[PDB]
Design a protein around this ligand. Structure first.
Ligand SMILES: S=C(NCCc1ccccc1)Nc1cccnc1
Ligand SMILES: S=C(NCCc1ccccc1)Nc1cccnc1
Lengths: 123, 122
């Protein structure tokens, strides 16, 4: 029965995305084939089961560069990364396959389930 | 156009608080009176105009310890910090004055406005 601020959670994510847009206190580079994506570790492990298992390990917690698998589509990771910071996922008929594969790799089980619904609703 | 996850922002904030509870990637110690509070700077800058101005400054951006004005109540600040990581304010008759004052200091305009509404209602 504490007083709840209905917008506070999304206003924090918005400001966090702004800090990423200005490159303020970002602490890791994600390398996907050729492309590089800078982000905050905390946001990364709060959304992805793979980044969680990487940074939860005290041995890997201080890494500033993560090389994803060479098979991982860079544009798919870019879509999922922007989803982490905005709650808005951009599924298209031309990217659904790459986005879903990337989601399973990053272990984002809710995004994977949504990708299936999108697939089922397009067959 | 894009698919909106209505519970996503809230689930992210919940997982951030879990990281704070286990002290994973906490990167600053906020000291009030003599009590230490461990937090993530990004969460602090996103919720507080004070912590925004502090950590935007390249002189203080990477400091490990920030000491607040000793006029600030610790229990009150603990309530604002908890609200930062949860969206829930433990606003009570016996702490609203301390919570509002601490909110003004941290430059948290929305929490101040909500405090004044409850005072004006009484
Ligand atoms: S921070 C955090 N906490 C969840 C705690 C948990 C860890 C593992 C299993 C259940 C809960 N990240 C996370 C972890 C995993 C997936 N997606 C995000
Ligand atoms: S990240 C951020 N504001 C995003 C950019 C902004 C800077 C200044 C004013 C509005 C927005 N933190 C903040 C700053 C000030 C108050 N409360 C939180």
């Amino acid at each position: 029965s504490q007083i709840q601020f209905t917008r506070h959670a999304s206003d924090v994510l918005l400001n966090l995305n702004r800090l990423r847009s200005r490159d303020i206190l970002t602490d890791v580079v994600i390398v996907v084939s050729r492309e590089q994506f800078r982000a905050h570790k905390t946001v990364l492990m709060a959304c992805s089961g793979l980044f969680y298992s990487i940074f939860t390990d005290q041995l890997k917690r201080n890494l500033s560069v993560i090389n994803l698998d060479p098979e991982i589509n860079p544009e798919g990771f870019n879509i999922l990364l922007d989803f982490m910071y905005t709650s808005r996922l951009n599924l298209r008929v031309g990217n659904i396959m790459a986005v879903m594969a990337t989601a399973m790799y990053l272990q984002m089980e809710h995004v994977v389930d949504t990708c299936r619904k999108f697939i089922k609703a397009s067959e």
